[PDB]
Amino acid sequence: TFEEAFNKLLKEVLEFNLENPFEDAKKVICIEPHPDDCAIGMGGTIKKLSDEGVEVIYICMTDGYMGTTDEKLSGHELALIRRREEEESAKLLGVRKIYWLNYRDTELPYSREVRKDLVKIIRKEKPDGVFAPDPWLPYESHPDHRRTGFLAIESVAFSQLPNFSNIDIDIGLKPHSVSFIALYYTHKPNYIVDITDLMELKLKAIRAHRSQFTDDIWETWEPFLRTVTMFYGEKIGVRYGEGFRVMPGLFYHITPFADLI
Amino acid sequence: VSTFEEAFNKLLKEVLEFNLENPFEDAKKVICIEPHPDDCAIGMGGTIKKLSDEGVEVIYICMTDGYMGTTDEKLSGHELALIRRREEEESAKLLGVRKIYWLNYRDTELPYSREVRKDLVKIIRKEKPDGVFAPDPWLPYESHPDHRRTGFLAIESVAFSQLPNFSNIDIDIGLKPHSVSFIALYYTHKPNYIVDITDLMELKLKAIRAHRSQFTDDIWETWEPFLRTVTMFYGEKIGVRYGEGFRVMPGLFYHITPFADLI
Amino acid sequence: MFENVSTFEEAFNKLLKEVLEFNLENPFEDAKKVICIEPHPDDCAIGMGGTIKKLSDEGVEVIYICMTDGYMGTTDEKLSGHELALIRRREEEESAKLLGVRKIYWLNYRDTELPYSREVRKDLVKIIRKEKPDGVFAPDPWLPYESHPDHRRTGFLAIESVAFSQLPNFSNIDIDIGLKPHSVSFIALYYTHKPNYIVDITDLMELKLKAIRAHRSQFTDDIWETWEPFLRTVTMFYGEKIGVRYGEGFRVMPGLFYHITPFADLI
Amino acid sequence: AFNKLLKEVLEFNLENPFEDAKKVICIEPHPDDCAIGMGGTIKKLSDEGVEVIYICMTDGYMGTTDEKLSGHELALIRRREEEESAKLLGVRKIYWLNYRDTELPYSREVRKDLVKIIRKEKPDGVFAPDPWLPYESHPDHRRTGFLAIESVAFSQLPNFSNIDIDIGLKPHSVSFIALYYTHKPNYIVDITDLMELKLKAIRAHRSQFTDDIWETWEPFLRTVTMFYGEKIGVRYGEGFRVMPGLFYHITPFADLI
Amino acid sequence: FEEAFNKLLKEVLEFNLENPFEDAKKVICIEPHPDDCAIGMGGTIKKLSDEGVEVIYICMTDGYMGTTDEKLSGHELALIRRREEEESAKLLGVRKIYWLNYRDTELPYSREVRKDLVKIIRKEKPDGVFAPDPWLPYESHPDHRRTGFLAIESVAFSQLPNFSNIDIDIGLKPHSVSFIALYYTHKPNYIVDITDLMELKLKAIRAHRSQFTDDIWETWEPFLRTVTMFYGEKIGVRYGEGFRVMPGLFYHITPFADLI
Amino acid sequence: MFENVSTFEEAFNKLLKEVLEFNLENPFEDAKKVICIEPHPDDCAIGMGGTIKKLSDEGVEVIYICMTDGYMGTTDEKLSGHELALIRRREEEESAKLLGVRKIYWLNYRDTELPYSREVRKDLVKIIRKEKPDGVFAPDPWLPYESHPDHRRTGFLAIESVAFSQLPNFSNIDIDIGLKPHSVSFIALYYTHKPNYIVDITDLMELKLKAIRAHRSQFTDDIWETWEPFLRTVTMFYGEKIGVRYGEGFRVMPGLFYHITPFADLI
Ligand SMILES: [Cl-]
Ligand SMILES: [Cl-]
Ligand SMILES: [Cl-]
Ligand SMILES: [Cl-]
Ligand SMILES: [Cl-]
Ligand SMILES: [Cl-]
């Protein structure tokens, strides 16, 4: 039967588990489309990880240029404003190294050039685990978000190939095989992390981005963010959870039953 | 509050004040965004008549020139494009539309790019519509890239229309930001609002048929049944013979919302 | 027309049965020539190898289009992509001989760099119009969680290319030089999570795993320890659907269902 | 050594460089450019019954200042203008790339279109604009010139646009390239006789040459063809730059012929 | 031919080389980076402002890349450089600046960038546009060559209602500029004498502090004086700024364009 | 400053001699490490084979950057591009050994498909920052009538990437991973029509013709009765300028002259 084969493939051939995927790890990259996405999607989990003495590094794809409705606030000023804010925010969470790709907000390319930037940082830092948005989240209308999710996944895979971006090799950045990928802002989580006793810090980590979260905007966003973490919290029977989708690496390619975990 | 279901209910009713009962009721000006000449007529022809008849000003933006839409080996794309503009003029006349913006990107060649966003943003800023209609880019098995990109780009351009740093030369020359009230996505597998068009079906078909280059009698043998089947698909969801479906969601739902599928 | 049907279900059924003349009985029964489009060397074999053999045996002329050269598929730092592309061409010439395939078009886009553009559509179109195949097989570009841009793109470009092959204004220089418009009879999509037609391959399973292993550069002994169970498992996912040990699954739809059809998922 | 290479190792005829040509392709950016740049010479070659085929890169869509006239209608107009203009010159085949006026890409895709028409028609000569004309401000012109030269070279390479080879169209070696609209011609054609007819074939492009526009352009065109005439002591000329293939590449003394 | 040429220029085109900027009321100066207008034609900008010509800038890029300071992020440089251009503009009597905001080193060469320039030209209706000569020999900065070409292209395409047609549908109508003047040119045919404005120009350039430190100025002051002397000497003055102006015609299919 | 010069000629002389300290007697004199950038395999050897050997001999470390893979350089219908590129990699490894070159960076863009983009500048700038060379050699992109885009682009991109290698906001991830900005001392352009410095290669000519000839795929004998005559003529075009038999010509300029300098052609 298929069922026995599926069970055996997962337990005996792949050895993939969902009890804690995040355990073997002392270095991880958290990849974000915009300054503030790491905090919003997985702030809780970044602290929880900070404390185990996990080196948590960010890559931020874009500069946040466009994130204002203020006509006398230029894009260049805002980028500088949001750089501060993410440093303020990252300290609150225990992150101590941010890479800035500096692609303009709303103009993140979907290209080999961007994959190379991520490949270079991966091959350099050799993290055990990479986090990134789930690019298959229903109704996600931000291309910066979609593109981030796809390039993170492809870059993880390609970092392992020496014919991919072969100049890194020629200068002694060697192929690197990441251990796991964990996708946040996801509709299909299979691993939830409890953040009931870290919720308050996260909400604090998030309001540091003052440019994005004013008094008035925060009217809507506090409940929206309270609802979301409940949406996840309720899957494992706590108040506040953060959801991740973790799969076997094989399941990201030609796997007709990927949705069965 | 206690549970997710309560939170979710509180977020819709109170925080955003989200209602599906009557989302187009307040509109005064709408833009209907179409990949090719005929998509407004096919996708939402009855609703556009209803809107016009209520005195809503309905404006089209047509993304492409329909250059490819022929199997006639002696109808060149240019001649077809001219034929199809005259067909949309007549089609839009029947539905009471008086203004059409032609972007003129070649059929099958619609880019997915900042440049096309700026086109839509320009027109949105200038017209200041309360509502914008466009295809649903997540329609399953949709295989026309002009269709998917129209969906995506119309949704992106609505959001970007509000940001003064986005296409900043608009602002410098007098086109201020604009905040649209609603987006409604047609050609959708997931509607949450249905318009009864039973009384306007025959008019819809005549406005579609105005696209003569596209609908020969022979093709109409498959297409009338196809069109009736689709509107019955929609109609049946609110218990009427013929309907037109729309997906309308709060703005927040188009972004980082993992329970977006719960309306 | 279609005015005397009373319900959506009645209308859907009549549209399928009478207007579109669609069934999933034996979709491939009348195939004289088919093209199997694959992203990378080895894709047709893994995705639909059993079925290609079964078609070959019935005297169906089966032709590959291979989208990429496979340049990137090695962790061996001392193996260059050029050499690998040369190796993989020989592995496919040998896979294809096993399965009965006599012709391959190599588009040669570099592995991981397959563009999504009109220029690629034009290649696929030139060939489709040359060969005039009855059927075209390609990966399903909606496979959930499919993370390879080359796969997603081959799928979308296959479907689009099939459609645009019939348009004289698409790539009009093909027409000016004696390559007329062509109307393919069916598309079938492999590597699909929504198959609606399963081919029994229980018998030919061993010949299939051997057309696959022939891609030695991709399948060393230590990798086959994972890939053999994955492959058998995928094949019992499909066969189970029709209660056989081993199947290959395909999604087939009427051409109309690939455009503006909100009930396309009801087949 | 310059001479023991030109008229010895390569055999470079500047006396009558066309003459052996049975079939030639004229590549224009826009409808009308063939007639403007080399209409006199086109007629010459037709009268000698050499087969002259046009490839028009673009649709001429943007060529009007009339706010009432769509670019689609203009393209249809200019297509029939060109069919007429060509009828007057002995041209009985025009290939239409249908890239939009102002939007001609500079890419592999476009080289492929040209390479496909080259490999199918197996021309002896290709005519095209000189992409190095000083102060040429039209990107469609510059890019036509460069893509023409590059496609001619690439048509000879089987690994270039290889599907062409898979479906029957073989590699092809053009004999000569002739660049018109050139500041540096090394071959001039007396067209003093054909001049009233050149101006006729050009004027058939009614959309482009209103009586009022023609007030400026008749003098402009006459001045241009004199500029060429003067160089071989005739009244009306059309200039071409022809060089041996090799000079199109790493040749520091290219400007010496 | 010599007869034809003369007649064309003098009767048909009625082409002035005596004083081509005489009729100007509004001109746009198109610069690749903040400081190019001041560097390439800053004395002419002041001469024009003083005579009541409205001089408007279009700046193509943000100057994001113009620092060797590892701790100065490109965004901060851009903010700093807008402040600097506004200080520099004040001194030259320029009141309006359009910022395209394409990143320094990344200016596209595309229809999209043409549409920005066309929109501005349609809106502003200038009698003149100034831009770098895209054919300056040995020019190595892609942002400079492309401003050149794109300004020249945009000026011509601003007149075609099918080019960027949404402009016209929204009532930015087509517009025909009277002249183009190319600065940073090896081939000038009009020199303005700026001898008595030289000092003010050097001041307007130094307002771009981020770009002209003291050490840097040791090289650039002599460079700039050498360049104004190259031009000045052509009309027997100490310091000139050169421009190439041709008839619109000569920008296209004109094999004898190099005889002016 | 520069207020007491009286004419442009006086100003230009002083600017060259005193402010820029531009010397054309011995431009390469202080070289410890140079990079030679070539569009295709064989371009360094053809362009400057003699000079690279004169440099090697002196203990100058010469590093090659090859922009493309030479995929397209064949008329042989049964020789694929992949195999050609594998062949040319070894033709260049030999050719280089002959000239004393001990490192080659292969960017591996496909021949005829070298992009003119920020991405390629990033590759150059990566290698320049890593190697920290005193000098860079590249084809002169302004060669009149040069009709190969790969060649034009390589020269423009070389000149740009040398300027941009200095700027820490250009390709800022390099800086973040320990690759700092670098300032090359000189640029020398080969394949040039306007050289201002000629190297005598008369006693190295034979060795050059041989290192060129290691590119067997490119130079048959049919080809060579036409390409030895061509090369001997080119090296005499340069040699005759300094009255030796065979020379290699270069264009050298102060970095200032690569930007907004209307008197660039005066040197
Ligand atoms: Cl009937
Ligand atoms: Cl009927
Ligand atoms: Cl009937
Ligand atoms: Cl001092
Ligand atoms: Cl001093
Ligand atoms: Cl001083």
Say whether residue B229 is in contact with chain C using an 8 A CB cutoff. Answer: yes
Task: Please tell me whether residue F169 adopts helix, strand or coil conformation.
Answer: coil
Closest CA to C44 of C147, C196, C151: C151
CA dihedral A139, C234, C32, C136 (to 10 degrees): 20
**Angle at CA D106, nearest 5°, toward E103 and C130?**
135
Dihedral of the alpha carbons of C119, C122, C127, C129, in degrees to the nearest 10: 180
Check D113 against C173: CB less than 8 A apart.
yes
Residue type, E257: A
Give the distance (Å) from ligand 4 centre to CA of residue E39.
21
Known binding residues of B for Ca(2+): 189, 261
Answer for the pair C251, C192: CB distance below 8 angstroms, yes or no.
Answer: yes
Buried b (16+ CB within 10 A) or exposed e, C39-70: bbbbbbbbbbbbbbbbbbeeebbbbbbbbbbb
Provide the pairing of β-strand B99-105 with D94-99.
unpaired
The residue written with tokens 């003064």 in the block is B164
Chains D and A physically touch (3 or more Cβ atom pairs below 8 Å): no
Cα dihedral angle (A39, A44, A48, A54), rounded to 10 degrees? Answer: -20
Three-state SS for F38-93 is ECCCCHHHHHHHHHHHHHHHCCCEEEEEEEECCCCCCCCCCCCHHHHHHHHHHHHH
Separation of first and last alpha carbons in chain B: 21
**F198, F238 Cβ separation under 8 angstroms:** yes
Cβ distance D61 to D207 under 8 Å? no
CA distance C243 to chain D (A): 42
Could you give the 3-state DSSP secondary structure of residue B64? strand
E strand or H helix at F26: none
Beta-bridged to residue A56, according to DSSP, are A28
Smallest CA–CA separation between E130 and chain D, in Å? Answer: 15
Spatial contact of F120 and F66, defined as CB atoms under 8 Å apart: no
Q: Is D246 in Cβ contact with F237 (below 8 Å)?
A: no
Q: Given phi > 0 = left and psi -120 to 50 = alpha, else beta, which region is C132?
A: left
Residue type present at position E103: R
| φ, ψ at A143 (rounded to 5°) | -60, -35
Q: Which of B192, E70, A6, B55 is nearest to C236 (CA)?
A: A6
- Contact residues, E window 60-119, toward A, CB-based 8 Å cutoff: 62, 73-76, 78-79, 82, 101, 103
Q: What type of residue sits at position B171?
A: I
CA dihedral B152, B155, B160, B166 (to 10 degrees): 30
Contacts of C174 (CB under 8 A, 6+ apart): C125, C126, C129, C180
Strand arrangement of the beta sheet that strand F103-109 belongs to = F103-109, F61-68, F33-38, F135-139, F186-190
Residues 11-40 in C contacting B (C-alpha not used; CB under 8 Å): 11-12, 14-15, 19-20
The SS3 of residue B85 is: helix
Q: Please, which residues bridge with residue D176 across strands?
A: D125
Hey, of C82, C110, C126, which one would you mutate to test binding to chain D, going by the most D CBs within 10 A of its CB? C126
Q: How far apart are alpha carbons E3 and D144 in whole angstroms?
A: 32
Contacts of F11 (CB under 8 A, 6+ apart): E222, E225, E226, E229, E230, F2, F5
Other beta carbons less than 10 A from residue C201's beta carbon: 23
- Residues of B within 8 A of D72 (CB-CB) are 65, 78-79, 81-82, 85
Q: State how far the Cα of F23 lies from the Cα of F16, in Å rounded to an integer.
A: 9
Chain E adjacent subunits, 3+ CB pairs under 8 A: A, B, D, F
C110 Cα to chain F: minimum distance (Å): 9
The two beta strands, B193-196 and B243-246, are antiparallel
CA-nearest residue to E188 within chain F is: F262
- Nearby residues of A148 by Cβ (< 8 Å), 6 or more positions away: A31, A32, A33, A61, A108, A132, A133, A135
CB atoms within 10 A of CB A100: 21
Rounded-to-integer distance, Cα A134 and Cα A190, Å: 13
Distance CA C48, CA C28 (A): 13
Whether E and D touch, i.e. at least 3 CB pairs below 8 A, reads as: yes
b/e burial code for range F226-245 (CB count within 10 A of at least 16 → b): ebbbbbbbbbbbbbeeeebe
Query: CB-hemisphere CA count at 13 Å for B233?
Result: 25
Run of H or E residues at D218: helix D211-229
Q: Is residue F37 within a helix (H) or strand (E), and if so which, with residue range?
A: strand F33-38
Q: Which residues is F189 bridged to in the sheet? A: F138, F251
DSSP symbol at E127: S
Using an 8 Å CB-CB cutoff, list chain D residues near C65: none
- Ligand 3 center–CA C1 separation, angstroms: 5
Other residues' Cβ atoms within 10 Å of the Cβ of residue C100: 18
The overall longest dimension of chain E from CA atoms, in Å, is 63
Q: Which two tokens mark D83? A: 């069919």
- Provide the phi-psi class of C13: left if phi over 0, else alpha when psi is between -120 and 50, else beta: alpha
Residue recorded with tokens 């992203």? C39
Rounded Cα distance, B193 and B238, in Å: 9
Here the tokens at position D216 are: 């400026």
* Structural domains of chain D, with CATH: 1-257 (3.40.50.10320)
By the 8 A CB rule, do E169 and E117 touch?
A: no
Mind giving me the DSSP string for D37-75?
A: HHHHHHHHHHHTT-EEEEEEEE--TT----TTS-HHHHH
| CA nearest to F223 within chain D | D9
Tokens for C49, please give them.
């190898």
Which residue in the set F86, F89, F110 is minimally distant from C86, CB to CB? F86
Q: What one-letter code names the amino acid at B167?
A: S
Residue type, B93: K
**Whether the Cβ atoms of residue D107 and residue D150 lie closer than 8 Å to each other:** no
Separation between Cα atoms, residue E222 and residue A135, nearest integer Å: 56
Cβ count near B2 (within 10 Å): 8
Q: How many contacts does D have with F, using Cβ atoms within 8 A?
A: 90
Half-sphere CA count of B139, side-chain side, radius 13 A: 32
- What was the structure determination method? X-ray
Residue E159 burial (CB < 10 Å; 0-12/13-18/19+)? middle
Q: How far is CA A114 from CA A119, A152, B21, F106, in A?
A: 9, 10, 45, 20
The two beta strands, E26-31 and E54-61, are parallel
Question: Could you tell me whether strands E190-193 and E240-243 are parallel, antiparallel, or unpaired per DSSP bridges?
Answer: antiparallel
From the list B140, B147, B229, the residue facing C264 with the nearest CB is B140
Q: What sign does the CA torsion over C237, C239, C242, C245 have?
A: negative
CA distance B149 to B135: 9
> How many Å apart are CA E232 and CA A190, to the nearest integer?
75
Closest in D98, D120, D162 to C172, CB measured: D98
Q: Exposed/middle/buried for B52, CB within 10 Å: 0-12, 13-18, 19+?
A: middle
E186 annotated to a ligand binding site: yes
Gaps in chain B (C to N distance exceeding 2.5 A) after: none
CB F69 within 8 A of CB F38: no
Q: How far apart are the C-alpha atoms of F115 and F153, rounded to whole Å?
A: 8
Q: Tell me whether residues B85 and D72 touch, CB distance under 8 A.
A: yes
Single out the residue of A143, D15, A175, D3 nearest to residue B254, CA to CA.
A143
Resolution of the experimental structure, in angstroms: 1.8
> Could you tell me whether strands C33-38 and C61-68 are parallel, antiparallel, or unpaired per DSSP bridges?
parallel
- Which residues 118-147 of A are in CB contact (within 8 Å) with C? 136
Alpha carbon dihedral F253, F255, F259, F264, in 10-degree steps, equals -20
* Interface-testing mutation among F102, F130, F169, F176, with chain A (most A C-beta atoms within 10 A): F176
Q: Which residues pair with D143 in a beta bridge?
A: none
Which of B166, B186, B183 has the alpha carbon at shortest distance from B125? Answer: B166
Q: CB-based burial of residue D22 (10 Å sphere; 0-12 exposed, 13-18 middle, 19+ buried)?
A: exposed
Q: Which residues of F touch E230 (CB under 8 A)?
A: 8, 11-12, 262-263
Yes or no: say if E136 and F262 are a contact pair by the CB < 8 Å rule: yes
3-state secondary structure of F191: coil
Q: Is the Cβ–Cβ distance between E12 and D224 less than 8 Å? A: no
For residue B159, the distance in angstroms to the closest alpha carbon of chain A comes to 9
Helices (H) and strands (E) in chain C, counts: 8, 7
